[PDB]
């Protein structure tokens, strides 16, 4: 029938000479079945019956791609949900669809005298809202779009930066590997997971010494005539103390979603379970932040946003030493007092008997 298939040629055709050259060197018993299968309908539920302006390829409201309706009167196009109200694709607008702006223009007939007239009219009607009047008039004349934070508030924090499509990314995201997929198809089998090659991953690059494991204190390098004693050292991204994949029991290389954090970073949330919430601010970076040194260093409590030194409330090591001793000794005192009241109620109920 002459149409080529996966094999390279028509189906009713043997191999060409090029393939056979570069690919060469120079009764059964399931006849049965319609005799042994007998139907099963033993199941319990067998009772159940059973002008040519070219339009865009972007949602100019959200600047991402999708299945979108295009405009008959301006080149701007939106996804079917990005309208006010959003339009169902099953019941499309019968005829030409006109965007907010072109519908606006043809409603105003390209005459600004009527614009100022109807503005005066509108501000005449609702003197109740005489202040917001301009905006109340103009709202129906601007094409929709998703809500982007004003940059003057994205700047208050430095560790808050937008992703590719306008998404929150608080620097705990590793990076856009992109070209690493070309790297993923490595000419020599040395793929990302680092299998069967850990000679120079156990050794610091700049310094040149060995990466020790905080929990077992051995860079187990094995011997690449005998590799069955390596142990896959990996280093954190924040503190960089190198850990074994067998001490922090996880078994994978966190390489795609985020950066890995050791078990040596304190909280970033609480869940008191008796269930209260956060104990940490955000990074109120720059000049604007105010550091405040206490005048009292023993029973000032104030927060959990402390900063240690030799509104963020600075403190010294010996101070927290004292405060933890206070916690410990008050806790032992109250525990002793609880045992005391327990035993004294016991003695009262005994002497009553």
């Amino acid at each position: 029938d002459s149409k080529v298939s996966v094999t390279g040629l028509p189906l009713n055709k043997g191999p060409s000479e090029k393939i056979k050259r570069e690919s060469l060197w120079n009764d059964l018993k399931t006849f049965l079945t319609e005799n042994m299968t007998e139907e099963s309908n033993i199941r319990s539920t067998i009772g159940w019956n059973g002008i040519d302006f070219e339009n865009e390829d972007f949602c100019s409201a959200c600047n991402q791609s999708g299945s979108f309706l295009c405009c008959d009167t301006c080149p701007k196009s939106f996804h079917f949900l990005c309208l006010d109200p959003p339009i169902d694709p099953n019941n499309l607008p019968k005829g030409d669809w006109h965007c907010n702006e072109c519908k606006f223009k043809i409603f105003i007939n390209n005459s600004m005298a009527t614009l100022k007239k109807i503005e005066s009219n509108f501000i005449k009607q609702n003197n109740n809202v005489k202040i917001f009047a301009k905006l109340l008039f103009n709202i129906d004349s601007h094409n929709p779009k998703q809500f982007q934070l004003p940059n003057y508030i994205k700047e208050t924090f430095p560790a808050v930066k937008t992703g590719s499509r306008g998404q929150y990314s608080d620097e705990n995201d590793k990076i856009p590997l992109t070209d690493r997929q070309l790297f993923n198809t490595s000419y020599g089998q040395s793929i990302t997971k680092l299998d069967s090659y850990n000679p120079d991953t156990h050794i610091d690059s700049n310094s040149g010494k060995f990466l020790i494991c905080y929990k077992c204190n051995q860079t187990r390098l094995g011997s690449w005539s005998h590799p069955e004693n390596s142990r896959l050292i990996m280093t954190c991204d924040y503190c960089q103390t190198p850990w074994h994949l067998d001490c922090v029991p996880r078994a994978s290389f966190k390489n795609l979603g985020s950066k890995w954090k050791c078990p040596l970073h304190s909280p970033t949330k609480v869940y008191k379970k008796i269930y209260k919430v956060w104990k940490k601010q955000r990074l109120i970076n720059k000049k604007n932040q105010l550091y405040y040194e206490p005048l009292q260093k023993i029973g000032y409590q104030n927060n959990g946003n402390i900063q240690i030194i030799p509104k963020i409330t600075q403190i010294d090591e010996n101070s927290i030493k004292y405060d933890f001793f206070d916690k410990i000794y008050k806790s032992k005192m109250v525990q002793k007092r609880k045992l005391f009241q327990f035993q004294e109620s016991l003695i009262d109920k005994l002497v009553s008997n």
């Binding site: 503190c239 103390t241 040596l264 970073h265 304190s266 909280p267 104990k279 959990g304 402390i306 240690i308 403190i315 090591e317 927290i320 030493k321 405060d323 933890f324 001793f325 916690k327």
Partner: peptide
């Protein structure tokens, strides 16, 4: 006394400064 020895042992064992800062931050949070 022996608790001063506790905290000095911690300062030496945990070794690095940043990690001791983290230890103290945990201790203060508690």
């Amino acid at each position: 006394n022996e608790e001063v020895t506790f905290f000095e042992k911690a300062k030496r064992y945990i070794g690095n400064k940043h990690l001791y800062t983290e230890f103290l931050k945990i201790l203060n949070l508690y």
